[PDB]
């Protein structure tokens, strides 16, 4: 399963209040939060397993953070007292930092992988406004319910890799652009 190798690694802050690794990725790059280079001298381990480089960050103190921007992940961590309980999973095989692709995967309904995928999708949806080519309907605030764009624009976001989800419903395009880094 996708969540087979998920493990928890409990760490503390170092001097300068850092983690001994940098957070990369985030929804703004269309990615899972993931660990930069984990160097031995700098991670203040407490308990659980060890962190390696490139691991996908899933949860901080039971708060799911996959699907969020780096900025939001940093914000969860800052409102968490030590020690930080990190649920992570190594990249490799079908486990990858690419959020677009992860959201295309199709797991069994009822599966832990499916449950998790839905949590990650909702996180993504909390930080983004979808875009569509269908006309503004009454009741809708442009830029909140939907960024209303032309097909040429949708096609251009598409080709540029700006979209994490996309598709047509009734002769019109619908997608989710990457949130901005803030």
């Amino acid at each position: 399963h996708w969540t087979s190798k998920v493990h928890e690694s409990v760490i503390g802050r170092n001097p300068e209040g850092q983690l001994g690794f940098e957070l990369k990725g985030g929804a703004e790059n269309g990615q899972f939060p993931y660990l930069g280079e984990v160097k031995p001298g700098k991670v203040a381990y407490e308990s659980g397993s060890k962190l390696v480089s490139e691991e996908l960050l899933l949860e901080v103190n039971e708060t799911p953070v996959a699907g969020l921007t780096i900025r939001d992940v940093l914000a969860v961590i800052k409102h968490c007292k030590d020690p930080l309980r990190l649920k992570c999973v190594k990249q490799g095989g079908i486990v990858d930092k690419d959020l677009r692709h992860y959201l295309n995967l199709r797991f069994q309904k009822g599966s832990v992988d499916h449950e998790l995928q839905q949590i990650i999708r909702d996180n993504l949806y909390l930080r983004t406004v979808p875009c569509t080519t269908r006309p503004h309907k009454e009741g809708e605030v442009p830029g909140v319910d939907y960024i209303f764009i032309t097909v040429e624009e949708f096609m251009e976001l598409e080709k540029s890799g700006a979209l994490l989800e996309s598709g047509t419903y009734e002769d019109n395009y619908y997608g989710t652009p990457k949130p901005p880094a803030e």
């Binding site: 949806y125 989800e165 996309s166 047509t168 419903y169 395009y173 619908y174």
Partner: peptide
Amino acid sequence: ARRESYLKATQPS
């Protein structure tokens, strides 16, 4: 949350 039109377009049924 996202509307049915968006999900019918972006998610496999």
